[PDB]
Amino acid sequence: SRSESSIENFLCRAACVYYATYTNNSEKGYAEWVINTRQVAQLRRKLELFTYLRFDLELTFVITSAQQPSTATSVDAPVQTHQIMYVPPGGPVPTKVTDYAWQTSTNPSVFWTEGNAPPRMSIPFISIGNAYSCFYDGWTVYGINTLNNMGTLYMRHVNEAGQGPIKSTVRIYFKPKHVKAWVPRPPRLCQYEKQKNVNFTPTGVTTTRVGITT
Amino acid sequence: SRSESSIENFLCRAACVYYATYTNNSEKGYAEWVINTRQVAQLRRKLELFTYLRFDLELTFVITSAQQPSTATSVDAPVQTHQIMYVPPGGPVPTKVTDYAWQTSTNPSVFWTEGNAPPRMSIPFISIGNAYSCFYDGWTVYGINTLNNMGTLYMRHVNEAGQGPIKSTVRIYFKPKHVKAWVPRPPRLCQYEKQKNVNFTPTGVTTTRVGITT
Amino acid sequence: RVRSITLGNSTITTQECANVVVGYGVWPEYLKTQPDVATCRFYTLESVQWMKNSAGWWWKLPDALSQMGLFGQNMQYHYLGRTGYTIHVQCNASKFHQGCLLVVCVPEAEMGCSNLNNTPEFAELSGGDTARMFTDTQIGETNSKKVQTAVWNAGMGVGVGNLTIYPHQWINLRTNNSATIVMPYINSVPMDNMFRHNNLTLMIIPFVPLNYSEGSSPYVPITVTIAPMCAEYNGLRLA
Amino acid sequence: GLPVMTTPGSTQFLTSDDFQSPSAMPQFDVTPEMQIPGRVNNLMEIAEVDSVVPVNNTEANVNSLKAYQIPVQSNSDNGKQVFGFPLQPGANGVLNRTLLGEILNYYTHWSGSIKLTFMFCGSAMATGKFLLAYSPPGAGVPKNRKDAMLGTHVIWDVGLQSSCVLCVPWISQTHYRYVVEDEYTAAGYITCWYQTNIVVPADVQSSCDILCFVSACNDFSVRMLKDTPFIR
Amino acid sequence: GLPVMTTPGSTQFLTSDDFQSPSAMPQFDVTPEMQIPGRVNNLMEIAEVDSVVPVNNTEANVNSLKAYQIPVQSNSDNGKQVFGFPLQPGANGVLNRTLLGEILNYYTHWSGSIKLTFMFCGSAMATGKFLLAYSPPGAGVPKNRKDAMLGTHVIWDVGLQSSCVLCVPWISQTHYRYVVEDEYTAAGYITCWYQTNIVVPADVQSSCDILCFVSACNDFSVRMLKDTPFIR
Amino acid sequence: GLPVMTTPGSTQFLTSDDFQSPSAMPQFDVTPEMQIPGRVNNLMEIAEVDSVVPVNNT
């Protein structure tokens, strides 16, 4: 049979889409990522085999920390707790580590402390339209389709800075769930040039041999 | 009865097949092991009692770390997280700690942090053939049978290096599950000489006594 | 009593009450693409001469019949195929001759090389219709691509006395002189390329050396007759 | 509490795991699903769609529509080869970037048969005969019209039919699935020969073109999803 | 959540544990299993296969086929011992590396009976009688044909039969299973004696050879799998 | 996964606990039990046996 070629088995795979770092002594030590499927070329190409898609989101966060240089005679930092806030489309957005947006009750947030299983949250299909669009032949800027907004993710240290700086890096894992696809399209042939548009530089149809006959 | 002499009770035992170390400040600090049953002579001999075998794989990883010398006044490294990636046959393979292969979505990976129960993953029978072959009287090089490829395992530190190096060692535990065997063969008598071939140096049939009569 | 068996345009005679050893209790059968029935003929290879100093002989199966009629023709024609075998081994000896033979068919008889770092070449691994002989001495390591043919290891690094695990028949000259082994198709894949993989290896090893008194024939011929069973190959047409 | 024991792998994150996860937005209520035309349930539906094969790779042609055009013209001597390519859907070059090839290059193992369609795009007054020959794996490519005819072949009369459809057979090492990529392995070829010259009336162009289409015909299947090699 | 309590040994890795594990490749779909001849369900099927016993250890013979050959010839005086070895399947040396011995050396405890088969490989015109004697554990080995005959024995006439089969009895300290390896313990012996000389006609060789075969006969069983001592 | 909560005393080792434990030797198969005379089910059977009293300590 061909169970492995179904849409669910083709797209329901976790993948690292974003990677960022943030320290705890900068006022700007927070990581942000607008949720978009165009960040990774491999995932973008697989999703762009279709025109309209409908799926849920499963996010897994792999957070690790590293001790930064200090002058303290002795450093004995306790276990670190991290906050991962999901801002739904239209929600308030932070600009500093100390900002009201971090305390918005309608911005769901996960508080996770190091040493445990990585945190995981799921976001459903949150578009006012009936499906996401990977291609839009029109204007809102050509081919934007603001109906594809999926929200933003923010990450920061919860603990106050101790006697030494701590730098943390977060790996976001992205997995579409219960995917439905419509209107097949030809696979992308030219290399992706910009994340925002479909612009391309003309390339050959395929690789070339010496002559039509063997 | 003889329940303990069945194929399942004979082969379904965990065993340490591979052992390696990797540090977190080398660019090359990653451990690799091509999955093969010829690494350990005791397991090789037990599997070579038969010609064709079919089994699942259960892998358990015992990872431990040790602090390396440093000059930092104070070292306060947080808990360490490790990545264990399984590369299916034909999948991309890393050459550095920072490599795209580590982020391939089709290469299943386990993220595990120290202090918890050891990580465990299971791989099924992944051969295009109907069974693995412990012996092949033919050419693809004599007696290779590339249909026995079982994939590769890779291991690396996820955390960035802190104020002191950390050296980790990984012990891979190998356990065939739901084993089926065919075509019994004579037990290996000569000592194994090479891991890749069946080459041997002629030895005596058995130990010797003084005379045929007591 | 003598029983005459005719296959195609060839016929041989066997003792009516000869015992046949079925390989693993399974008779050769068809894959549950293209079969061939003109191949179903006895192929009598050249007889070998069992002597006092004989160490043994072996033949790789697909290869032994690579230069025999349509079977070889089918081997070069089709890319893939599968077949069983029926092997007859017969010795012509008098009641004044003594000796014991082991007649065993080994599936996937991968053989080692005299040089530990290399592998044996095709010539040394198989002689086609010609037989390959074991050696009662140990092949030196200097030699680069020859098979380690010491009999007591059977070229596989195992105890030769343990070869009875594989379908076999003993030929004790004082009791019997013929052996019949029926070997089914045994492989990890339903079909395979016959030119790059020898599924079976027939071995004849004298455990008790041939002995006779002066005046008797100083040799005992051994005749091997192989009849492919249920052979079938891949199709060559469109759909 | 109830006594429990944590087994190995309890707090691990396996990227292929399938576990229930908490919803970040419970009580959201999603937009109901509408009926959009063209629902896709399997990539093999895409694999079974005919697509134009760039037979004429000819690097001066890969940056044009001439890559798909197979030239045919009236030649003085007969029996020349029109074209020929190995039947490797996923590695060669002619079938690599077609709809079938793109799907195949997302997997490591594949099975099934290849449907090849040839369309004659000359004038309605042109007549001629073509010999389309299939060489099974292992057998070499034909060197002459006679050798092609002695093997598996179809005589194609453009004067009677504008299209010919061939379904090349699976034929694999009893493996059911075989590797999408390959290494110096028996490939199997398709080739075309001039059985006759192209006969044309006055005021009709003798030089014509042929289009080739490929698609999966029989029970096609894939296994072991992987990364496509065409992205950077 | 539901109240739970973790018992001792919750996060431990016991190498003999039997727990469900996550699959690294879910949705892979494995190649269906085919019917391969020669399926093995128990090692004891291998243990019950007859194999040739190297009775003639005789270090000048262990590197040849003479290790399996028991010499027999016409001797002037009668009543000599042909051969003899202790019945220790797994420790002695003659039964150590046989098919039965190899399986036994993978376990610490074993039970059952030993089937010994002797085949005369002389000429069809040779005649003679052999006394095959079994000494139970504790009892010493016979020193004469008379002492062997007074015990458990079988008179073997090669002129009438070419093979003789003996099934030595279990007989253990009401232990059901006994150690594969042993320490200066009652062993039990099998021995062979010339009842008569080998009678031969003219132009027939008097010197012959005997082959010995061993296998498990009655309800054989093993226990407590271990590492084989034959690997480095 | 299924939501759970660990109560106090979850990872403790109480020497009088009665919990299922993993077997180090699964698939061993033990020697069957035989009928040995003189089976004891309670120490009070020993307590009810007459014994000689050392009255003359001295």
TrEMBL record, chains A, B:
Localization in the cell: Host cytoplasm; Virion
- Domain Picornavirus capsid positions: 1-148
Span of the secretion signal? none
**Which family would the database say this protein is a member of?**
Belongs to the picornaviruses polyprotein family.
The subunit structure is: Interacts with capsid protein VP1 and capsid protein VP3 to form heterotrimeric protomers.
Protein role: Lies on the inner surface of the capsid shell. After binding to the host receptor, the capsid undergoes conformational changes. Capsid protein VP4 is released, Capsid protein VP1 N-terminus is externalized, and together, they shape a pore in the host membrane through which the viral genome is translocated into the host cell cytoplasm.
Please identify the protein, giving its name as recorded. Genome polyprotein
Organism of provenance: Coxsackievirus B1
